């Protein structure tokens, strides 16, 4: 009676897979947005990395320019980028537009994946299937560990290839005399920022496994 069973139960396995990656991407996307728009890390870094001596600016000047930049990167802001006290080139202006376009598009996919995760997740949970949580947690821990290595071994070369991968021009190659903002965006900050994203993704993996372990515990205790 098993002979007709090779062709069976394909649909729900697909939904779990789609939901698994949507949760994965959603966590990655939320982690990125948390770091890009959260000013606590950079505010800490101004003093810790001594950015005032790197940039030859005061602590409030650095915050003023950084605030204007982060506001510009918001999807709800439609004006152009105009730094309060720093010079900027045409190509530099074009680079920050590219950055904003990346952030907007990631947010758009993120909205789709969050709704696939929620709707697909309610469907599977109402089937008493909490497996998308396990698979989702697996993807969220493999991804940061896999990228930990290029950050640790050679962060600087990873930075250049990351840029060569995401951007289609060389405008990301800032000249401090034409785009002085680069002085107050030191590479060590980007490394802390990159490490911050992975930690949030890692934290997301913990939260998913923990909810998976809770639901499994409920069914086995439901037996008892
Ligand atoms: C189970 C999945 C868990 C997902 C959690 C993975 C880690 C992501 C961290 C935070 C996400 C929620 C925080 C809100 C996300 C957007 C943050 C933001 O927009 O920053 C605004 C800024 O604080 C204004 O100054
Ligand atoms: C339509 C259905 C959607 C359902 C799913 C929605 C869940 C939203 C979760 C996080 C929002 C993250 C959005 C990131 C936008 C950040 C904007 C921002 O924080 O602006 C900061 C400002 O620039 C500082 O001055
Ligand atoms: C239509 C859907 C097409 C898009 C498909 C999904 C989007 C994933 C793309 C890139 C992920 C990389 C995430 C990196 C987010 C931050 C990168 C960044 O902004 O770089 C800053 C740098 O300092 C500037 O020079
Ligand atoms: C203090 C330095 C911080 C860096 C280290 C932070 C901890 C790493 C996060 C999770 C590891 C495992 C703990 C919880 C398990 C969740 C990860 C997971 O999804 O593992 C699934 C596994 O396959 C099912 O056995
Ligand atoms: C190791 C390869 C990946 C390394 C990259 C991961 C870190 C980027 C993520 C968040 C940055 C948050 C700060 C956002 C500040 C604006 C980004 C920006 O436009 O920076 C200009 C750039 O430095 C012109 O070269």
Coordinates of C-alpha atoms and ligand atoms in Angstrom, one line a residue:
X1 CA 0.0 0.0 0.0
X2 CA 3.1 2.2 0.2
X3 CA 3.7 2.2 -3.6
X4 CA 1.4 5.2 -4.2
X5 CA 3.2 7.2 -1.5
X6 CA 6.2 8.7 -3.4
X7 CA 3.8 11.5 -4.5
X8 CA 2.6 12.7 -1.2
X9 CA 2.4 15.7 1.2
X10 CA 4.4 18.0 -1.1
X11 CA 2.5 21.2 -0.5
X12 CA 2.9 21.8 3.2
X13 CA 6.7 21.1 2.9
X14 CA 6.9 23.9 0.3
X15 CA 5.0 26.3 2.6
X16 CA 7.4 25.6 5.5
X17 CA 10.3 26.2 3.2
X18 CA 8.9 29.5 1.9
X19 CA 8.0 30.6 5.4
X20 CA 11.5 29.6 6.7
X21 CA 13.3 31.8 4.2
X22 CA 10.9 34.7 4.7
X23 CA 11.5 34.6 8.5
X24 CA 15.2 34.4 7.8
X25 CA 15.2 37.3 5.4
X26 CA 12.9 39.3 7.6
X27 CA 15.2 38.9 10.6
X28 CA 18.2 39.9 8.4
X29 CA 16.3 42.9 7.1
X30 CA 15.1 44.0 10.5
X31 CA 18.6 43.6 11.9
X32 CA 20.0 45.9 9.1
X33 CA 17.3 48.5 9.5
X34 CA 17.9 48.5 13.3
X35 CA 21.6 49.4 12.8
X36 CA 21.2 51.8 9.8
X37 CA 18.6 54.0 11.5
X38 CA 19.6 53.4 15.2
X39 CA 21.9 56.2 16.3
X40 CA 22.9 54.6 19.7
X41 CA 25.8 52.6 18.2
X42 CA 27.3 55.5 16.3
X43 CA 26.7 57.9 19.2
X44 CA 28.8 55.6 21.4
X45 CA 31.4 55.3 18.6
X46 CA 31.9 59.1 18.3
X47 CA 33.7 59.0 21.6
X48 CA 35.0 55.5 21.7
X49 CA 36.7 55.7 18.3
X50 CA 37.6 59.4 18.9
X51 CA 35.9 60.5 15.6
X52 CA 36.5 64.1 16.6
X53 CA 40.2 63.6 16.1
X54 CA 39.8 61.5 13.0
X55 CA 37.5 64.1 11.3
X56 CA 38.8 67.3 13.0
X57 CA 35.2 68.1 14.1
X58 CA 33.4 68.5 17.4
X59 CA 31.1 66.0 19.0
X60 CA 28.0 68.0 18.1
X61 CA 29.2 68.7 14.6
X62 CA 29.5 65.0 13.9
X63 CA 26.1 64.3 15.4
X64 CA 24.6 67.1 13.3
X65 CA 25.9 65.8 10.0
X66 CA 25.1 62.2 10.9
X67 CA 21.6 63.1 11.9
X68 CA 21.0 64.8 8.6
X69 CA 22.4 61.7 6.7
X70 CA 20.2 59.2 8.6
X71 CA 17.2 61.4 8.1
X72 CA 17.9 61.5 4.4
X73 CA 18.1 57.7 4.3
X74 CA 14.6 57.4 5.7
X75 CA 12.1 56.2 3.1
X76 CA 9.6 58.8 4.3
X77 CA 12.0 61.6 3.5
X78 CA 11.8 62.9 -0.1
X79 CA 14.3 65.9 -0.2
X80 CA 17.9 65.8 -1.3
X81 CA 20.9 65.3 1.0
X82 CA 22.6 68.5 2.2
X83 CA 25.2 68.1 5.0
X84 CA 25.1 71.0 7.5
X85 CA 28.9 71.6 7.7
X86 CA 30.6 69.2 5.2
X87 CA 31.4 69.5 1.6
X88 CA 30.0 67.0 -0.9
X89 CA 30.7 66.1 -4.5
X90 CA 28.3 65.2 -7.3
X91 CA 29.5 61.6 -7.3
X92 CA 29.2 61.5 -3.5
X93 CA 25.7 62.7 -3.7
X94 CA 25.0 60.0 -6.2
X95 CA 26.5 57.3 -3.9
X96 CA 24.2 58.2 -1.1
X97 CA 21.2 57.9 -3.5
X98 CA 22.4 54.4 -4.3
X99 CA 22.5 53.6 -0.6
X100 CA 19.0 54.9 -0.2
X101 CA 17.8 52.8 -3.1
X102 CA 19.3 49.7 -1.6
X103 CA 17.6 50.4 1.8
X104 CA 14.2 51.1 0.2
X105 CA 14.3 47.9 -1.9
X106 CA 15.3 45.8 1.1
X107 CA 12.4 47.3 3.0
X108 CA 10.0 46.4 0.3
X109 CA 11.0 42.7 0.2
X110 CA 11.0 42.8 4.0
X111 CA 7.4 43.9 4.0
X112 CA 6.5 41.0 1.7
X113 CA 8.5 38.4 3.7
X114 CA 7.1 39.6 7.0
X115 CA 3.6 39.1 5.7
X116 CA 4.4 35.7 4.2
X117 CA 6.0 34.7 7.5
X118 CA 2.9 35.9 9.5
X119 CA 0.2 34.5 7.2
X120 CA 2.1 31.3 6.3
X121 CA 3.1 30.9 9.9
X122 CA -0.5 31.1 11.2
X123 CA -1.5 28.5 8.7
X124 CA 1.2 26.1 9.8
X125 CA 0.7 26.8 13.5
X126 CA -3.0 26.0 13.1
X127 CA -1.8 22.7 11.7
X128 CA 0.2 22.2 14.9
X129 CA 3.4 22.4 12.7
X130 CA 6.1 24.5 14.3
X131 CA 8.9 23.4 12.0
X132 CA 9.3 26.7 10.0
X133 CA 10.6 28.0 13.4
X134 CA 13.4 25.3 13.5
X135 CA 14.4 25.7 9.9
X136 CA 14.1 29.5 10.2
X137 CA 16.5 29.4 13.2
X138 CA 18.9 27.2 11.4
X139 CA 19.2 29.7 8.5
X140 CA 19.6 32.6 10.8
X141 CA 22.6 31.0 12.6
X142 CA 24.4 29.7 9.5
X143 CA 24.3 33.1 7.7
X144 CA 26.0 35.2 10.4
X145 CA 28.6 32.5 11.1
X146 CA 29.4 32.2 7.4
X147 CA 30.0 36.0 7.1
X148 CA 31.8 36.2 10.4
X149 CA 34.8 34.6 8.6
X150 CA 35.4 37.3 5.9
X151 CA 35.0 40.0 8.6
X152 CA 37.5 38.4 10.9
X153 CA 40.1 37.2 8.3
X154 CA 40.2 40.4 6.1
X155 CA 37.6 43.0 6.9
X156 CA 39.1 45.6 4.5
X157 CA 39.0 43.4 1.5
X158 CA 35.5 42.3 2.4
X159 CA 34.4 45.9 2.6
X160 CA 35.7 46.6 -1.0
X161 CA 34.1 43.6 -2.5
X162 CA 30.8 44.2 -0.7
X163 CA 30.7 47.6 -2.3
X164 CA 31.8 46.3 -5.7
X165 CA 29.0 43.8 -5.4
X166 CA 26.1 46.1 -4.3
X167 CA 27.0 49.3 -6.3
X168 CA 27.3 49.7 -10.0
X169 CA 29.7 52.7 -10.0
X170 CA 32.9 53.7 -8.2
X171 CA 31.2 56.6 -6.5
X172 CA 31.6 54.8 -3.1
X173 CA 35.3 55.5 -3.4
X174 CA 35.2 58.8 -1.4
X175 CA 38.0 61.3 -1.5
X176 CA 38.4 63.0 1.9
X177 CA 39.1 66.4 0.3
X178 CA 35.9 66.2 -1.9
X179 CA 33.7 64.1 0.4
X180 CA 34.9 64.8 4.0
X181 CA 32.0 62.8 5.5
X182 CA 34.2 59.7 5.0
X183 CA 36.5 61.0 7.8
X184 CA 33.6 60.7 10.3
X185 CA 32.6 57.2 8.9
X186 CA 35.7 55.2 9.9
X187 CA 36.1 51.6 8.8
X188 CA 36.1 50.4 12.4
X189 CA 32.6 51.8 12.8
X190 CA 31.5 49.8 9.8
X191 CA 33.0 46.7 11.3
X192 CA 31.2 47.3 14.6
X193 CA 28.0 48.0 12.5
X194 CA 28.5 44.7 10.6
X195 CA 29.1 42.8 13.8
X196 CA 26.0 44.4 15.2
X197 CA 23.8 43.2 12.4
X198 CA 25.1 39.6 12.8
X199 CA 24.5 39.7 16.5
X200 CA 20.9 40.8 16.0
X201 CA 20.4 38.1 13.3
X202 CA 22.0 35.7 15.9
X203 CA 19.6 36.9 18.5
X204 CA 16.7 36.4 16.1
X205 CA 17.9 32.8 15.7
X206 CA 17.8 32.3 19.5
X207 CA 14.3 33.7 19.6
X208 CA 13.0 31.4 16.9
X209 CA 14.5 28.2 18.3
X210 CA 13.2 29.2 21.8
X211 CA 9.6 29.5 20.4
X212 CA 10.1 26.3 18.5
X213 CA 11.3 24.5 21.7
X214 CA 8.3 26.0 23.6
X215 CA 5.7 24.6 21.1
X216 CA 7.4 21.2 21.1
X217 CA 7.5 21.2 24.9
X218 CA 3.7 22.0 24.9
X219 CA 2.8 19.0 22.8
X220 CA 5.0 16.6 24.8
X221 CA 3.7 18.0 28.1
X222 CA 0.2 18.0 26.4
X223 CA 0.7 14.2 26.4
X224 CA 1.5 14.1 30.2
Ligands
LIG1 C1 11.5 36.3 15.5 C2 12.1 37.4 14.7 C3 12.6 38.5 15.6 C4 13.1 39.7 14.8 C5 14.2 40.5 15.5 C6 15.5 40.3 14.9 C7 16.4 41.4 15.3 C8 16.0 42.7 14.7 C9 16.0 43.8 15.8 C10 14.9 44.6 15.9 C11 13.7 44.4 15.1 C12 12.5 45.2 15.6 C13 13.0 46.6 15.9 C14 12.4 47.6 14.9 C15 13.0 47.4 13.6 C16 13.2 48.7 12.9 C17 14.2 49.6 13.7 C18 14.1 51.0 13.2 O1 13.4 51.3 12.3 O2 14.9 52.0 13.8 C19 14.3 53.1 14.2 C20 15.2 54.0 15.1 O3 15.2 53.4 16.4 C21 14.6 55.4 15.2 O4 15.6 56.2 15.7
LIG2 C1 2.1 46.6 4.7 C2 2.3 45.5 5.7 C3 3.7 45.7 6.4 C4 3.8 44.7 7.5 C5 5.2 44.6 8.0 C6 5.6 46.0 8.6 C7 6.6 45.8 9.8 C8 7.4 47.0 10.0 C9 8.6 46.7 10.8 C10 9.7 47.5 10.8 C11 9.7 48.7 10.0 C12 11.1 49.0 9.5 C13 11.1 50.0 8.4 C14 12.4 50.7 8.3 C15 12.2 52.2 8.0 C16 13.0 53.1 8.9 C17 12.5 54.5 8.9 C18 13.1 55.2 10.1 O1 13.2 54.7 11.2 O2 13.5 56.6 10.0 C19 14.5 57.0 10.9 C20 14.9 58.4 10.6 O3 15.6 58.5 9.4 C21 15.8 58.9 11.8 O4 15.9 60.3 11.7
LIG3 C1 13.5 43.9 -6.1 C2 14.4 43.2 -5.0 C3 15.8 43.4 -5.3 C4 16.6 43.5 -4.0 C5 16.8 42.1 -3.5 C6 16.8 42.1 -2.0 C7 17.8 43.1 -1.5 C8 19.1 42.5 -1.1 C9 20.2 43.4 -1.6 C10 21.4 43.6 -0.8 C11 21.5 43.1 0.6 C12 22.7 43.8 1.2 C13 22.3 44.5 2.5 C14 23.2 45.6 2.9 C15 22.4 46.7 3.5 C16 23.3 47.9 3.9 C17 24.3 48.1 2.8 C18 24.7 49.6 2.7 O1 23.8 50.4 2.7 O2 26.0 49.9 2.5 C19 26.4 51.1 3.2 C20 27.8 51.5 2.7 O3 28.4 52.3 3.7 C21 27.6 52.4 1.5 O4 28.9 52.7 0.9
LIG4 C1 28.4 36.2 24.1 C2 28.8 36.2 22.6 C3 27.6 36.2 21.8 C4 27.8 35.3 20.6 C5 27.2 33.9 20.8 C6 25.7 34.1 20.9 C7 25.0 32.8 21.0 C8 24.7 32.2 19.7 C9 23.3 32.0 19.4 C10 22.7 30.8 19.4 C11 23.6 29.5 19.6 C12 22.8 28.4 20.1 C13 21.9 28.8 21.2 C14 20.4 28.6 21.0 C15 20.1 27.8 19.7 C16 19.6 28.7 18.6 C17 20.4 28.5 17.3 C18 19.7 27.4 16.4 O1 18.8 27.7 15.7 O2 20.2 26.1 16.5 C19 19.3 25.1 16.0 C20 19.8 23.7 16.2 O3 20.1 23.1 14.9 C21 18.8 22.9 16.9 O4 19.5 22.0 17.8
LIG5 C1 32.3 43.4 5.5 C2 31.5 43.8 4.3 C3 30.3 44.5 4.7 C4 30.7 45.8 5.4 C5 29.5 46.8 5.4 C6 28.6 46.4 6.5 C7 28.2 47.6 7.4 C8 27.2 48.4 6.7 C9 25.9 48.3 7.5 C10 25.4 49.3 8.2 C11 26.1 50.6 8.2 C12 25.3 51.6 9.1 C13 25.8 53.0 8.9 C14 25.1 53.6 7.7 C15 25.8 54.9 7.4 C16 25.5 55.3 5.9 C17 26.2 54.3 5.0 C18 27.0 55.0 4.0 O1 26.5 55.5 3.0 O2 28.4 55.1 4.1 C19 29.1 55.7 3.1 C20 30.3 54.8 2.6 O3 31.2 54.6 3.7 C21 31.0 55.4 1.4 O4 32.1 54.6 1.2

